[PDB]
Structure 1
Amino acid sequence: MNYTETVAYIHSFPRLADHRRILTLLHALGNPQQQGRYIHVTGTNGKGSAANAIAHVLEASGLTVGLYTAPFIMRFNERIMIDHEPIPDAALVNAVAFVRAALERLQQQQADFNVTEFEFITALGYWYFRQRQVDVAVIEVGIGGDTDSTNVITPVVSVLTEVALDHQKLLGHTITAIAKHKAGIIKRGIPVVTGNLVPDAAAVVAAKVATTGSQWLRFDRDFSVPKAKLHGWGQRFTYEDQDGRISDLEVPLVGDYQQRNMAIAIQTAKVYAKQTEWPLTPQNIRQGLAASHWPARLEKISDTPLIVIDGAHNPDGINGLITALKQLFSQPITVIAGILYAAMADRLTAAFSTVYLVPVPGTPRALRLKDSWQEALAASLNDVPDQPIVITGSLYLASAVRQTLLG
């Protein structure tokens, strides 16, 4: 297959649900998941950004780092990176061919054997990271924890950023139910770094670490961000933990939640470094954070005209954006919102000058309004060329804009 056919092959896999199928596949690929080192990252929100920064910091320190994240923003290849370089097209072709050949051998021994799409990609990623002999692979959990396709590893450190109800449809009706799923990535004697979890989620974690004997480092208990403020399109902040303070770090990320994610990232990188006796300096941490750009999440992509893209997709997500925009902009702005209810909107229209409401590009249109983001963008630029434009409401919308404007 060529590159186009290969990506198509990946997206063709079924939906079907222990880890027996993926473990069968990984066994045929020589159990790459049992070799090397891992950092395992979960949480309802912030797992991606934390994983990205952990990788940037460890890369600055001189490690070769695999990073497995979802979704992609510009191109599929981005889901599997080494030192923030997406898997090359030709390399993807050959890796797909290898895992395909393995799958096919298995289907000879057991006629109706198969795996899901996420199972296949995960297996491939574990195999590729081992082939290239990365020092460590930072692994973002797809959903939950315990039963996720990624959960076939013993990491050096586990991370639980936050527990909220966003994925309740799949993980349970209570915080306690969801927290139990996430706590499944906590392993015997392996340290766990968390956010300041809500009481029901903390109680689950407390009980888990009692059983595993894990060291638990908790945001706002064992580490914190005592100082933080806006500085350009980003934040200047101070990190504090058991060892003291790292002063006036800078990150090109806006949003209060990102302080927590970045503190979580710092504490994790430090834990990893300690557990593996690897040197990690304040300057390594400083350099890594400076590069910890996170595409399509409150990201300025053009100066003149001034264009910003964002993936906020829930009431609280929009509340957090509104307060951010208010801090970042004193002048009137255009907001282009495409969401998949009448809340999160209403809040927008009662906050900004021009609000346009559009469809999410890959979704059916369900029953001010424009037919496309492109039409809304063109209108604003024609009418008021110098008015900044923020496009929000959906990570998928934000990706489509980024592909068109930056590609």
Structure 2
Amino acid sequence: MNYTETVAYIHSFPGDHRRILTLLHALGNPQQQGRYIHVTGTNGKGSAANAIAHVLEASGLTVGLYTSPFIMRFNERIMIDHEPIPDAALVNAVAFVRAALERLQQQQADFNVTEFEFITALAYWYFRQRQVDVAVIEVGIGGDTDSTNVITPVVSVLTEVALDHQKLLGHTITAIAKHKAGIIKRGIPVVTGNLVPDAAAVVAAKVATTGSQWLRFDRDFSVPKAKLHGWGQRFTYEDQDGRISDLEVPLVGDYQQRNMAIAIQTAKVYAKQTEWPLTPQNIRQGLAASHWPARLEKISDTPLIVIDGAHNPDGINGLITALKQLFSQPITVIAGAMADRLTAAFSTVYLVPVPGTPRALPEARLKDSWQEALAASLNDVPDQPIVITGSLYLASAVRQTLLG
């Protein structure tokens, strides 16, 4: 197949890990080789994972990064030193995994794997083929039964536990926490955010049984100082070894302080566990040189356009709150019911549908598309800033169009 057929192939796919393990076994069990950092959490995993990678890359390691979802194009989900797998490399890898799959389907007639299982198996194989020093692995959903959970990492990360995936993980924080805690492994250290009580209890009980060292935000490490500074933040990190002062990261949003602190502590743990050098300078450089697409990103200066994947209140309110701090003057917001918090916060607020979703009737200011809303604002008030937010899918659609 060619590249386009290959991607189509991947997306044509339909409780334990037997299916993926069978595929991995046919691929030579690449998941058993090399090193990994396993990251989960209801919110913040992509952010923490991305930062951990930048930091370790700056220290001189070749780093695999597996994240979801993609923003510009599929290839972004499998990176090595932040370079997406090349189109031709994807074709070859898909061909290789497909051949193993088909061979397997000869032995066991109705053998199949899910889409995430196929991609995950391919990513593990690819990371090993390229012999990366370490692969930073973002859990798809939950932890314990997530398709990525067939590895023993050097360190595990649990950013936070919230109700976002109730329909699959459970009805209570405790239930969801048990899923996330499933990536904590025997003797392997775990770095977490300052988890709410119910989640913290689940983790405390888990590390008691695994004997894992548990480093927790606001207990073992923290961010004593932090302020907005340009389209980013200047902050101080502190842990058992002291402070790394005035670090800078091109990321706005209060919650990103916790995610960056988690990233820093995790990189330090990884480096210590592997007897690898990691300096405050490596950390500073990784954080500075890092970048975050579609998450409160100012994709343009004149006109001033910002795209955001703010999905939940924490993000949108962190947005509204950041917007307020970032902008003291009138702006336009194109959002595709955190809506009420926007219309009361900003002058011009347009509501549009999310590009790849069914338009639904309003339950007892509205435009038919982001392009129409963008065009209108630019025509009416060319110099008024425009912030696009609401969904990652909309953000991604806009970025693809405007930065393509």
Q: Could you say which TM-score interval applies, normalised by the shorter chain?
A: over 0.9
Shift of 1:183: 0.4
Note the alpha carbon deviations across 1:30-60, whole angstroms, 9 max, x for none: 0000000000000000000000000000000
Give me the whole-angstrom Cα distance separating, in 2, the residues matched to 1:26 and 1:346: 48
Q: Deviations over 1:39-94 (max 9, x none)?
A: 00000000000000000000000000000000000010000000000000000000
Larger mean Cα displacement after TM superposition, 18-27 or 283-292: 283-292
Q: For 1:102 and 1:20, how far apart are their aligned partners in 2?
A: 16
Unaligned 5+ segments in structure 1 are none
Q: Distance in 2 between matches of 1:285 and 1:331?
A: 35
Distance 1:174 1:291 in 2: 38
Which secondary structure does the structure 1 equivalent of 2:341 belong to?
A: coil
Shift of 1:319: 1.7
Task: Tell me which residue corresponds to 1:89.
Answer: 87
Count of residues paired in the alignment:
401
TM-aligned CA deviation for residue 315 of structure 1: 2.9
Q: Distance in 2 between matches of 1:154 and 1:356?
A: 47
What secondary structure, in the 3-state scheme, does the structure 2 residue paired with 1:348 have?
Answer: helix
Note the C-alpha offset of 1:227: 0.3
Distance 1:75 1:316 in 2: 27
After superposition, what is the alpha-carbon deviation per residue over 1:103-138, rounded to whole angstroms, capped at 9, x for unaligned?
001000000000000000000000000000000000
- C-alpha deviation, 1:313, in angstroms: 1.5
The 2-side partners of 1:351 and 1:188 are apart by 48
Q: Is 1:187 the equivalent of 2:181?
A: no
The offset of 1:291, in angstroms, is 2.1
Match of 2:253? 255
SS in 2 for 1:347: helix
Separation in 2 of the partners of 1:320 and 1:283? Answer: 29
CA distance in 1, matches of 2:54, 2:311: 26
Secondary structure at 1:217's aligned position in 2? Answer: strand
1:155-182, CA deviations, whole angstroms, 9 ceiling, x for partnerless residues?
0000000000001111001111000000
Shift of 1:314: 2.2
1:232-255, CA deviations, whole angstroms, 9 ceiling, x for partnerless residues? 000000000000000000000000
Instruction: Calculate the TM-score normalised by the size of structure 1.
Output: 0.98
CA distance in 1, matches of 2:34, 2:254: 34
Mapped partners of 1:299, 1:153: distance in 2: 33
The residue aligned with 2:383 is 386
Query: How far is 1:292 from its partner?
Result: 2.1
Distance in 2, matches of 1:122 and 1:374, equals 35
Aligned counterparts of 1:291 and 1:76: Cα–Cα separation in 2: 23
**Structure 2 length as normaliser, TM-score?**
0.99
- 1:353 Cα offset (Å): 1.1
Q: Distance in 2 between matches of 1:73 and 1:11?
A: 16
The Cα shift of 1:294 comes to 1.3
Q: In 1, distance between residues paired with 2:7 and 2:159?
A: 31
User: How much has 1:333 moved relative to structure 2?
Assistant: 0.2
CA distance in 1, matches of 2:290, 2:168: 30
CA-CA distance at 1:317 after TM superposition: 2.6
Looking at structure 2, the residues matched to 257 and 60 of structure 1 have their Cα atoms a distance apart, in angstroms, of 24
The more displaced of 286-295 and 45-54 is 286-295
Moved more, 316-325 or 114-123: 316-325
CA distance in 1, matches of 2:247, 2:185: 32
Aligned mates of 1:314, 1:70 — CA distance in 2 = 17
Flag structure 2 segments of 5+ consecutive residues without an equivalent.
Answer: none
Deviation at 1:143, TM superposition (A): 0.3
User: What are the Cα deviations for residues 290-341 of structure 1, in whole angstroms up to 9, with x where unaligned?
Assistant: 1221110111000011000001112333222111100100110000000xxx
Say which SS state the counterpart of residue 166 (structure 1) adopts: helix
Tell me, yes or no, if structure 1 residue 31 matches structure 2 residue 29.
yes
Q: State the identity %.
A: 99
